[PDB]
Amino acid sequence: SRKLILFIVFLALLLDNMLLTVVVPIIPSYLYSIKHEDKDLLNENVQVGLLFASKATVQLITNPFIGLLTNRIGYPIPIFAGFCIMFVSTIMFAFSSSYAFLLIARSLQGIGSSCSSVAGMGMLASVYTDDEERGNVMGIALGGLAMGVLVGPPFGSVLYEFVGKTAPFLVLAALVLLDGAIQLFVLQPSRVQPESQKGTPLTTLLKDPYILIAAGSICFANMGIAMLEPALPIWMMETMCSRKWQLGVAFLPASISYLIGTNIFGILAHKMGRWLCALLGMIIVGVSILCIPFAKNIYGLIAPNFGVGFAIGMVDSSMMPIMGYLVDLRHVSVYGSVYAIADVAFCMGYAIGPSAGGAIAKAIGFPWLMTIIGIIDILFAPLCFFLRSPP
Numbered sequence: 588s589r590k591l592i593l594f595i596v597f598l599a600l601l602l603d604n605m606l607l608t609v610v611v612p613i614i615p616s617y618l619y620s621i622k623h624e625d626k627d628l629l630n631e632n633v634q635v636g637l638l639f640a641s642k643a644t645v646q647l648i649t650n651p652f653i654g655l656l657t658n659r660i661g662y663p664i665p666i667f668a669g670f671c672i673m674f675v676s677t678i679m680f681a682f683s684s685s686y687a688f689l690l691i692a693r694s695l696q697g698i699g700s701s702c703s704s705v706a707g708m709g710m711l712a713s714v715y716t717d718d719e720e721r722g723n724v725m726g727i728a729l730g731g732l733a734m735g736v737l738v739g740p741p742f743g744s745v746l747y748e749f750v751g752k753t754a755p756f757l758v759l760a761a762l763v764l765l766d767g768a769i770q771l772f773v774l775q776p777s778r779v780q781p782e783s784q785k786g787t788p789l790t791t792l793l794k795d796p797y798i799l800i801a802a803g804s805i806c807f808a809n810m811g812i813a814m815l816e817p818a819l820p821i822w823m824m825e826t827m828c829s830r831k832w833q834l835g836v837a838f839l840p841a842s843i844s845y846l847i848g849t850n851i852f853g854i855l856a857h858k859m860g861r862w863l864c865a866l867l868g869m870i871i872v873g874v875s876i877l878c879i880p881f882a883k884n885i886y887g888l889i890a891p892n893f894g895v896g897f898a899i900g901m902v903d904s905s906m907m908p909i910m911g912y913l914v915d916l917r918h919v920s921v922y923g924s925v926y927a928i929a930d931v932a933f934c935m936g937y938a939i940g941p942s943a944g945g946a947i948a949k950a951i952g953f954p955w956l957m958t959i960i961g962i963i964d965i966l967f968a969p970l971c972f973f974l975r976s977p978p
């Protein structure tokens with residue numbers, strides 16, 4: 588039943604990102620409508636920034652605890668717990684309306700995300716035996732992480748606009764319940780205990796300056812989109828008075844470009860130079876983030892989002908193998924390590940992006956927020972030169 592576990596983990600990760608991102612086009616607009624119907628927007632910026640960063644904050648906080656828990660008790664129980672609490676979070680998103688319950692839903696979704704991510708990928712890694720097959724199947728589930736983040740925004744936005752706020756979350760609860768049911772019913776026979784081969788702890792592993800540089804580059808490149816995601820709908824609603832179904836169609840190009848850039852540069856990086864590809868990715872994401880605020884129409888927004896997605900797809904494809912090579916070279920390696928580092932990096936971005944950027948959006952505004960983050964990416968691009976390994 589190796590394939591079935593792969594399907595379960597793929598669906599878990601896809602639903603996780605879909606729930607993570609469907610919040611982007613409907614909930615900031617929901618709070619805007621519920622409070623206005625501007626100092627109102629000034630307070631709402633920081634409120635929604637904290638609401639969006641709570642998921643990553645709680646996930647980063649609870650990741651080591653859940654890792655210890657799955658080491659002690661096994662993989663399947665954390666996976667099922669993650670499915671159950673993700674379904675709870677989806678339902679509470681669907682029905683609750685006040686900001687406190689939305690915050691609780693976001694925190695519960697973060698805990699469930701940590702559960703599903705770490706327990707699933709670990710169990711998926713342990714079930715398979717062939718190294719090539721392991722790499723291929725992890726490439727499938729990690730690709731699902733991206734397919735979910737792609738399909739989520741437009742679907743959530745359009746259904747919210749047409750039917751209502753309760754329907755997309757109801758559908759998400761339906762899929763999450765189906766995945767939990769299939770895992771519980773047709774994947775009974777045995778429990779998988781994680782491997783006894785433990786790599787370097789994340790403390791010293793992140794203490795490495797080179798791994799720190801790569802993780803910081805990933806963190807900033809994704810913090811770009813992490814600051815885009817909770818403030819771009821508000822910027823559109825206060826600038827172009829766009830319909831509520833376009834708030835997902837505008838984020839569609841970023842994810843499509845991420846897919847395209849990943850597929851292209853996962854083959855082009857080892858020939859164009861991984862460090863050079865990462866540096867160009869940082870530069871391009873900086874330029875695109877600068878170009879985003881100067882758009883008057885969504886037609887003028889499809890291009891900068893395309894550049895943003897293309898750059899991240901390039902940075903990720905140029906750093907994941909770089910992270911693996913650095914870990915294998917300067918430390919002892921277990922297949923989880925790389926992912927773990929990336930996870931922390933991602934968390935950091937989404938723990939500092941919306942929480943702080945929104946405050947900036949309240950103090951200096953949105954265009955300036957984007958100018959600062961783009962300049963940060965541009966000036967961090969030269970730091971990728973310290974990835975000049977001889978091969």
Ligand SMILES: COC(=O)[C@H]1[C@H]2C[C@@H]3c4[nH]c5cc(OC)ccc5c4CCN3C[C@H]2C[C@@H](OC(=O)c2cc(OC)c(OC)c(OC)c2)[C@@H]1OC
Binds near residue numbers: 838926
């Ligand atoms: C919280 O996370 C995410 O939201 C996912 C995305 C992060 C970011 C993003 N967000 C958006 C949100 C939008 O609307 C709001 C619109 C566009 C985007 C884009 C384009 C840029 N990018 C796309 C998504 C990337 C996903 O992560 C991986 O794909 C991945 C792949 C791996 O191997 C192939 C890994 O192993 C090393 C790995 O380790 C952790 C992670 C990441 O999941 C962690």
